[PDB]
Design an enzyme around this catalytic site. Structure first.
Site, PDB file in Angstrom:
ATOM      1  CE  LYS A   1     -11.306  -1.975   3.414  1.00 46.36           C
ATOM      2  NZ  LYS A   1     -11.208  -3.125   2.363  1.00 46.36           N
TER       3      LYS A   1
ATOM      4  CE  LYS B   1      -6.832  -1.057   4.442  1.00 47.24           C
ATOM      5  NZ  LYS B   1      -8.110  -0.523   3.532  1.00 47.24           N
TER       6      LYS B   1
ATOM      7  CB  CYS C   1      -1.174  -0.171   1.316  1.00 46.94           C
ATOM      8  SG  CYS C   1      -2.267  -1.930   1.020  1.00 46.94           S
TER       9      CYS C   1
ATOM     10  NE  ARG D   1      -1.847  -6.303   1.497  1.00 46.78           N
ATOM     11  CZ  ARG D   1      -2.523  -5.554   0.722  1.00 46.78           C
ATOM     12  NH1 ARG D   1      -1.361  -4.485  -0.393  1.00 46.78           N
ATOM     13  NH2 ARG D   1      -2.464  -5.911  -1.294  1.00 46.78           N
TER      14      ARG D   1
ATOM     15  CE1 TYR E   1     -16.763  -5.856  -3.053  1.00 42.41           C
ATOM     16  CE2 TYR E   1     -16.466  -6.719  -0.782  1.00 42.41           C
ATOM     17  CZ  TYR E   1     -15.964  -6.030  -1.774  1.00 42.41           C
ATOM     18  OH  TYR E   1     -15.119  -5.492  -1.374  1.00 42.41           O
TER      19      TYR E   1
END
Ligand SMILES: *[C@H](CCCCCC(=O)O)CCC(=O)O
Ligand SMILES: *[C@H](CCCCCC(=O)O)CCC(=O)O
Ligand SMILES: *[C@H](CCCCCC(=O)O)CCC(=O)O
Ligand SMILES: *[C@H](CCCCCC(=O)O)CCC(=O)O
Ligand SMILES: *[C@H](CCCCCC(=O)O)CCC(=O)O
Ligand SMILES: *[C@H](CCCCCC(=O)O)CCC(=O)O
Ligand SMILES: [Mg+2]
Ligand SMILES: [Mg+2]
Ligand SMILES: [Mg+2]
Ligand SMILES: [Mg+2]
Ligand SMILES: [Mg+2]
Ligand SMILES: [Mg+2]
Ligand SMILES: [Zn+2]
Ligand SMILES: [Zn+2]
Ligand SMILES: [Zn+2]
Ligand SMILES: [Zn+2]
Ligand SMILES: [Zn+2]
Ligand SMILES: [Zn+2]
Lengths: 323, 323, 323, 323, 323, 323
Positions: free
Chosen positions: B246, B194, B129, B215, B311
């Site tokens: 999230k 996050k 990222c 990550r 979604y």
């Protein structure tokens, strides 16, 4: 930049992420729900729950030594019945499946902590959690029977009577029946906040409840956060030794809210539908199961739960993933 | 039995459960994340995310219009690049993919609120990222970069710049960068809390991110509830118009704790792996999708989420499940 | 008797007490403080701290490796100097003892998190925690000095600069000093609430600090609970990555109050005199060391401490008491 | 530097450290626990507790005038028995050691506040805190006897009945027995939060309890902070005049938590193991006893306690260290 | 009657009331305000403040020594000027009365903490607390002036600069002024919540302030509890080392509210009219002075005051009522 | 200066100080305590209370019309007895002074709110607040008589029975006796927190109580803030219609604390000693009485009280100072 604040400082290495890990999950947090079918000779795999299967009663004794040996210190017995009547009366028989399931466990492994799912949905013709009527499941008729059951389970060795009926006053009902009969030390693991949840999908297939309809006149609305806390605080007032939130996975805000409103221990049940969702997504190759399983359990513990009911407990135990 | 209190009185019928339902979910609550792949010809469906498709930039305007007709108010844009370098500068090009997804969306449907996913993981050669160095992703090198990107996004028409690089100081850097560029009116939807979560399993495939490793040096540890809150509050102090948790599904405690620690709007992201778990168990017959999707999303809402990135939003919309 | 509530039900057996135990201590919780004396040949054990030894810099790398094998993640470095002047500048030498303990540690075990004790009491001729004047230890003269030291420590590899001079503004000064020197990534473990306590009895001997008098004009009064909190919160405002209460044993109230007043990690230092009290009573047959050590450390954890600096850490580790 | 905030400003002198000292310890805070052996002619020094010794009953009268004269206004009587049976029945004898110990004190010094340690561990053959069984120490059989005792102690002059058994419902048990018999004004000093602690080491040697095993089926887990508060709040509901935390030293977070959860007075017991740890470390020369003793007591008071039980009370009194 | 709860059990005797007394007052709690008149020969007693005398600067050193022998730790200096102009600049003279009271006090007794009353009401020709204009006392003109005064006071030896002009921004102005002048170590005792109260009746006579009208445009309204708190918190934000409520007697609510809104030390001023009310009623036989003085002062302490400015301090000290 | 914050802005004028005055005192806040002596023909001035005098019973009727006419809507009757026995039995006589005092008031002015000080200190030989013994004032013997009194006062027209004895359980005692006799609507103005205060000086002279000793075995310690709140919360549980803090003046921190801990109305009694202190200081010319009286009452109201008992009520009423 000029940030005096750099959160990332403690995430630089695995050693550092470890020193500062706020929550930790171990095996003493898991309660293994076990399925036991009377009058069958061979193990029955549940389809909706990949890897779980019904333990034939004749093998209960062997498996509970196995469970005990991998380190699981507690079990929640669920029975698949072969003697189901209108009132679900087998469940309060001096030697019903309920009693035998407990007796066989405490006999086979004395120090094993036995919780007895106390209800009627698996022992009734209709499959509702109690006495049915011209009005619906009669609340107080069910409490008299939940008490009758409690005493034979207590009498047969369960350390915990876990009222699973979602009947108002079930905990007080069960406290008195247990006391009166000389079972002052038998504890109650109250399914205090038990929702009428769509996550129980795989469960009527797993423990053969014969109900076609729903439990929304007694199990509470998934959306009612205030009422869910209220449900649990009433069981505290009625003497429950322990409270519980089921399901757990989509209700961690509920577990947290409750952890801040009582000093009592709190259990959280990771239901069949949660197990199923983990299992079937790992098969499709969508997620890493061990990763999602530990994060799933860890989130439950983070939200505030003291004990977690999980069908993954034994396999995490044996593959020695949780010590 | 003499119970004065009887929770069940308000559960007796569908009409009463509706009168008393505490949390109600609507389509106004849903943001639809969309994946647009540049330089391709037909829709390319994602494997781990059953029913989800990578939109060919050449149909994006046909699509933004379809989503728009559905009743949907907002979308989050994620791009699958064909021009990936070491710093991921296709992200900050006046005409990079990022800027084109916003302009197409905003040009086709000017009423649409387009939220721009602001990062480099889909645009760098190595998948991280941001800027990589002999020690890891450089915080401040990536900040300057996120700034350049935010300004090209604003200028392309995006109404929300949403930094997802999990970099320290990102809201501040993006906020300054946007004001300096005469976009003092462009809002910031920060992915404030996050987590380095395993529920993103199906996203490396869906988004086409090059990353091989983890990550964890920037995205935060799942178990740290206190850190989770610190993360978001630092972003409120930095001016974020909106905060976010999230993933959301297994972080409902985090959502509730944060709702109680800020007066700012909170978004909650029901990530890919969450989407997959519900699909596959549904496919494998273990659960009723409609009932689990609705219950999962409403749970997110009950915990304090103001907006939920899902979604399932178009499907729920067109099938007219949520109005 | 009709007690509905009976706390004893969950104490009936070892299995139940473990199921319900609220706080669990691990080795991940322990930081080991180590004393390294430069220019000496063999280990020199401390008298008031039975079993504790002054490590000869010439074996420090043999030792950091042993601690590392034990399972230990972190150490706090305290140096016994042979080059002590009036300002204690061996502390801020590019190659002073301070910088050498970090580089040896970090060079031998790169996974090790090395916390550098940042002060002047062991390096000044007069024993005070900084610059002395016709009025006492000068706050701001010592701040400039602590800065020089922190930067040499960072540059030597220390992952944490821990200011123990009890000087006002130290976190800010060290934070600026470290950022200016390109160590914006070097964290700060502040001894935020550092009391002028009599539990440090055996430390002047262990550390070899020259001081004759008291440290009451800078180290704070034991009785001031409100001040204790103010002290740490001023350090949070100054950017400390981690806060600390020291001593910890007789300050468990302070630990709990502070856990409730900040979301930051909190360290707790079980000081020398605490270590000695447990040793000698154990030697004098009055207590069971293992049982008191474990209970004392877990108490620190129960009160809110995230990390506990303990001299018993290697012994607990190697004897494999804590994993 | 530019710190507007300089905490050090109020620590510049001894006069200044005094004006701003937030907590203060005086003699009215101490309760002197006293050891009294029946049927012995000469004083018996306890080994594990350097400086403490058993008072031969025949001298009780002289010493309690001595105690009273140095200013100690309260005592907690502990008896060493010579008539120990299975139920520990001497303890509820019209003239058992318990009664005599009280009667002799109130007779000898009328205004002296007499607390009577109400239990059975020193008067039982087995040495457990009550009636033992095929199941363990029977809770309700013990309450009937705790009541029987209370009334003879009350009847013999104790101002306080201090239930030391850790039996559920002991406070309510004792309230009724005292009332019924016309002892409505006799107060209860509840050992409300009494842990199964390793710090009681020196105590079975000091008051001759004949138990080989442990008290973990009734005294609570050291690690359970929520349960410890709960334990104390139940005794508030049962009418206790005063609550207590034992041990005190490693449980000051517990004393603080409790001080914020009730308006009742709170006692804290600095147990034999704490005294022992202070005494044996000062002998080895590791710490200054008077310093560590005053700081130890002061920390207890700072955490929130109103009264402290300390074996150092008399000697601090006489050496006139506390006025 | 079956009262389980009976508050009276702990009130039965003097010994029990002392064991349980929640708040204890000492001399360490008292600051003595002293009035020194320059250029006069013998002590001039104040009429409305029976037993209080204006000290002739020529005996101030004889007096500071007497107060010092009494046991008193601190004094607040108030000067009666003979050199009164329009701005009250005798206050900011390198050698004005203000600077001389501190130097004499500090020179005679170097252990004494001298608090300097920092204002202009006793030094201006018109009696107002600062610079007068065609619209009232100018806030900012007086701020510059208070600064000059604070620096001359610090330089004269005063340990505390106490701004009593009730001007906005005074702590900030004085704090800057003192730091700029190398008195970053000089503390500030702010009369933070200073009411326009009628209990100051006897002070215009005692202090010799020229004012004819009212001080309501700067000193605050007695009825504003919320404003009272805002006032002090603004001063905490400005760096005051200590906050204060004045008058204290009829503002005990303010004291308690503020104790709960800050961790800073709080002073409480028992003003002149309070002193007078107790004297005259005592003289007129209506009350027992000793008992009312002690109860009034302890009440101030019970409400949260850390330090209490009292005119009865020497008398209470010498007569050895408070030690 | 640059203060954005200028509190002084709202104190610029009398109009402005008025718009923003947070608290306001009116006549509906005052209850006038009135003194009534039986068997006397002429008015007796109290010495210790300048301006107050005993109302000869034969004039009660005239004065209560006078009281009523100036606007005082409530009175608290205190009787000076001429028929005092050991139990204080006149006070519960069908036509004792207590009854007559009430009957005469309600008869003379129907809408006047009559509170009846319910106690025995003025009707007993010994002057203690109840039944005296070989142990002291017997608590439960006094409750039976407080009830007996309550019913005749109720029966004779008092709107409020104000238990002034400080006997535990007095409110519950009085609630039942009133109910049983058909006085379900007669309210209780509980002297819930009534201290053993030195401010009651002038009162035994004003209402002729014949006690030489003190009331410290029943009226509570002035210094006990936690206990004072506890005292009042018990009377809430026993049904009191209204709570009270006496004295009021030096206990405004207590009134505030309590106002935040209950929804019940709170009375505050400005006792004889407070009146005396105001009156005698104004005579000496030390203070302005009207100023200090309004500020005194206003502070009480500011602390949280709903009703204030003040001996200045009538004169403030008549001189039309309070409307
Ligand atoms: C309640 C059954 C007990 C909980 C089992 C949770 C799980 O799903 O694993 C009623 C379930 C039903 O709808 O049949
Ligand atoms: C962050 C990408 C945005 C969140 C994932 C959205 C989803 O539905 O999973 C990093 C993803 C990664 O780890 O590559
Ligand atoms: C501070 C040195 C660090 C704390 C002591 C560590 C221990 O185990 O005691 C000053 C110590 C001193 O007073 O010299
Ligand atoms: C409880 C004995 C009463 C407390 C004495 C505290 C002390 O250690 O001084 C049981 C103690 C045991 O384990 O024998
Ligand atoms: C402020 C002078 C300091 C407070 C009064 C001290 C006392 O004991 O009354 C202004 C006083 C005034 O109004 O002149
Ligand atoms: C209580 C008398 C009722 C309160 C009167 C208050 C006042 O002083 O005006 C006992 C008072 C006594 O000590 O006699
Ligand atoms: Mg329920
Ligand atoms: Mg962040
Ligand atoms: Mg500090
Ligand atoms: Mg208990
Ligand atoms: Mg101000
Ligand atoms: Mg009472
Ligand atoms: Zn059921
Ligand atoms: Zn990314
Ligand atoms: Zn130091
Ligand atoms: Zn015992
Ligand atoms: Zn002034
Ligand atoms: Zn009375």
């Amino acid at each position: 930049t000029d940030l005096i604040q750099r959160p990332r400082r403690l995430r630089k290495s695995p050693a550092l992420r470890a020193m500062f890990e706020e929550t930790t999950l171990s095996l003493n947090d898991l309660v293994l729900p076990i399925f036991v079918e009377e009058e069958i000779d061979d193990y029955k795999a549940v389809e909706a729950m990949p890897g779980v299967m019904r333990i034939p009663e004749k093998h209960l004794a062997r498996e509970i030594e196995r469970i005990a040996n991998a380190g699981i210190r507690s079990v929640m017995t669920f029975g698949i019945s072969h003697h189901t009547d209108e009132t679900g009366s087998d469940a309060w028989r001096e030697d019903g499946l309920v009693a035998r399931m407990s007796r066989i466990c405490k006999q086979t492994v004395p120090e094993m902590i036995v919780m007895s799912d106390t209800c009627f949905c698996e022992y009734t013709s209709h499959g509702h959690c109690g006495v049915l009527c011209e009005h619906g499941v009669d609340n107080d008729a069910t409490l008299e029977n939940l008490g009758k059951q409690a005493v034979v389970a207590a009498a047969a060795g369960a350390d915990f009577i876990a009222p699973s009926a979602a009947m108002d006053g079930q905990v007080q009902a069960i406290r008195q029946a247990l006391d009166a009969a000389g079972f002052k030390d038998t504890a109650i693991m109250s399914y205090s906040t038990k929702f009428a949840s769509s996550f129980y999908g795989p469960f009527r297939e797993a423990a053969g409840s014969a109900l076609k309809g729903d439990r929304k006149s007694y199990q509470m609305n998934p959306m009612n956060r205030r009422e869910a806390i209220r449900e649990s605080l009433l069981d505290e007032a009625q003497g429950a030794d322990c409270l519980m939130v089921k399901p757990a996975g989509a209700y961690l805000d509920i577990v947290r809210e409750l952890r801040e409103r009582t000093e009592l221990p709190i259990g959280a049940y990771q239901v069949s539908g949660e197990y199923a969702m983990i299992k079937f997504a790992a098969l499709a190759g969508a997620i890493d199961e061990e990763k999602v399983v530990l994060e799933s359990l860890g989130s439950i513990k983070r939200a505030g739960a003291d004990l977690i009911f999980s069908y993954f407990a034994l396999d995490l135990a044996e593959k020695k993933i949780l010590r």
